[PDB]
């Protein structure tokens, strides 16, 4: 009801992922990359 903020997704990155690649870095991308 108050909102579940535990789940996050990446919005910003300098490139696209390769198959089964994982990127969990939090360095601010030209913005904080996760929302």
């Amino acid at each position, epitope marked *: 009801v108050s909102g579940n903020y535990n789940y996050l997704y990446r919005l910003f990155r*300098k490139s696209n992922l390769k198959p089964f690649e994982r990127d969990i*870095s939090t*360095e601010i*991308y*030209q913005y904080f*990359p996760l929302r």
Partner: antibody, heavy 120, light 104 residues
């Protein structure tokens, strides 16, 4: 000792061309990727191009479409072919092996002395 | 293309003073930054790799740290031999880029 020796500099006219070379010795040239970096009087360091150890993949900066990078691992020589040179390309051209944990993997950083190219 | 900047562009300090140079990236480059020192008439010399690792032979008075977009280069005590232009360079992705350069 490790050496990188640039040559082939000089003065050319606008729209002309010039081929530079860098002779390498003292290290396993054929296992490393190589970079070209230039510096004009009054300015900072500008990255120009990179070639992989096998002479396969090539990358370019402001110069893409005009400059070509190549190497010959049997002569330990790195080349840069510059076509359609402009006044803005006046600079001292260095060959280098830049320490890089992501792409070339080089653990050591080497530089040449640089050769001056003037366009006018 | 990742754009690099440095601040201040030029600084005035005496021998024995503490000197700090800030390098900032337009994009997050984690810890893949090199620091170079260039004296007039000479090729650039590498002092620091991977943001904070010192090169062999580099005096202990030199140091640096940082991650992401904000990096710092420090001289704990400026020596008369430390007058040079300092550059930061990113190698997170191609093309590689150098900063404007800071005059000490």
């Amino acid at each position: 000792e490790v050496q990188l020796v640039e040559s082939g500099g000089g003065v050319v006219q606008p729209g002309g061309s010039l081929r530079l070379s860098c002779a390498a010795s003292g290290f396993t040239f054929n296992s490393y990727g190589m970079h070209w970096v230039r510096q004009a009087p009054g300015k900072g360091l500008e990255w120009v191009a990179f070639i992989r150890y096998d002479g396969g993949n090539k990358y370019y900066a402001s110069v893409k479409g005009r400059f070509t990078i190549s190497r010959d691992n049997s002569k330990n020589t790195l080349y840069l072919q510059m076509k359609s040179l402009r006044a803005e390309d006046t600079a001292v051209y260095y060959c280098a092996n830049l320490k890089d944990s992501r792409y070339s993997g080089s653990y050591y950083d080497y530089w040449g002395q640089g050769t001056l190219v003037t366009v006018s | 293309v990742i754009w690099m900047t440095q601040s201040p562009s030029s600084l005035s300090a005496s021998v024995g003073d503490r000197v700090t140079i800030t390098c900032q990236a337009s994009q997050d480059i984690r810890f893949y930054l090199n620091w170079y020192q260039q004296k007039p008439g000479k090729a650039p010399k590498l002092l620091i790799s991977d943001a904070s690792n010192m090169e062999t032979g580099v005096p202990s008075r030199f140091s640096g740290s940082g991650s992401g977009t904000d990096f710092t280069f420090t001289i704990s005590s400026l020596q008369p031999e430390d007058i040079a232009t300092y550059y930061c360079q990113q190698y997170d992705n191609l093309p590689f880029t150098f900063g404007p350069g800071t005059k000490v």
